[PDB]
Symmetry: C3
Subunit: 163 residues, 3 copies
């Protein structure tokens, strides 16, 4: 009756194999795998609240935690290389990983706090890109940064709602 | 019989007339209108469950079913013509049409509709699986991303079917 | 435990300062920030207040700017920016209706309804025009918009 149980394991396995395969590839391609990963992790959380499966939550929490650091590494290197566009994309996947991590926390304060620092770090990083973008005079890039700035803020209010 | 009821009928008339017009034109435009069809059906299902218009459930479910089969034919032809992107794009509207069909099935209690949506997901899973091995063979890592993105979305449909 | 209040004020302050500066710049750029502006007002859902009235006012001002760009776009003959501008109008109407139900402002609910009702009127005109002009691609964009006003208008009915 549980055909999705095979499909659930099949999906993460294909993503994890791709993630290791794409690790050496272009950062933009790496961000694409992380985008699908955090999109996948949300449904593994959605299919563990329906289940009594607490073990599946630990799996999704580890993958969301690992996806968070991967987005952070690409964000640090991209900003160092001068690419604010690819960098700003990385914080987007970073906060998205933090958002699902906060959802994973509900039904462990340490996971909620861990997701909080992930969101807090993202807000700190985008602030540097936003303030820098205003200095460079690129109003178009400030929109993307301000668009992101709202998204971390929108996520950050949810942690308060989670208490 | 409110004022929104007129807007619902007005929307389906414009969608149905366009769908027949673009069938002979290009699949990409046909996919765009088909995408709105499942988007429109989702909002019409939410107001027929709220207004208790059980007749509208059959109408909205039929349109999602028709959008599913229309998405499937263009998905089948696209893979035959070698356009895996348009095929993978078409499968997205298919699973979304299957998703709303599964959601209507669980609410209305139509066990036949739940399996029909289930087979739609099974068909979509077969195509992406075939596309995935093909995309991996040609070395197009970009296409496996779209396929894995689609593959993940199929799981969301299977989660809802089990919830019934 | 009100650490977000600084970030909340920082978001509205950064958006409002940018919104006033870019208004005279490019219409496409003005529409994009208005999308972020209407996205920013959504954070007002957290009702702790005095800041709620400020953010609700900002949504009112963002609504008219999208309509003004929509009017000029149709006047300039570019239906594309109009449908894009009309799109941001409907989200502004959507967020305005949600804020109305929080404080129970029945006048705001009818006001937000009229923006969507008018937005459906313009998009209906563009749709018949786009089909008449033969730009089948624009009819999809117009029909794409048409669904969203219906989704917002259906939600407004769910309130009353």
């Amino acid at each position: 009756e549980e055909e999705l149980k095979k499909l659930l394991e099949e999906n993460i396995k294909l993503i994890e194999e791709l993630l290791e395969e794409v690790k050496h590839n272009d950062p933009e391609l790496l961000l694409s795998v992380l985008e699908v990963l955090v999109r996948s992790v949300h449904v593994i959380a959605e299919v563990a609240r329906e289940q009594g499966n607490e073990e599946l939550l630990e799996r999704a929490a580890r993958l969301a935690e690992e996806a968070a650091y991967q987005a952070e590494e690409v964000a640090r290197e991209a900003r160092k290389r001068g690419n604010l566009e690819l960098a700003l994309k990385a914080l987007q996947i970073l906060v998205n990983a933090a958002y699902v991590l906060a959802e994973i926390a509900r039904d462990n304060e340490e996971l909620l706090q861990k997701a909080h620092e992930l969101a807090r770090e993202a807000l700190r990083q985008v602030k540097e890109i936003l303030e820098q973008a205003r200095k460079e005079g690129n109003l178009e890039l400030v929109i993307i940064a301000l668009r992101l700035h709202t998204e971390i803020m929108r996520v950050l209010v949810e942690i308060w709602r989670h208490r």
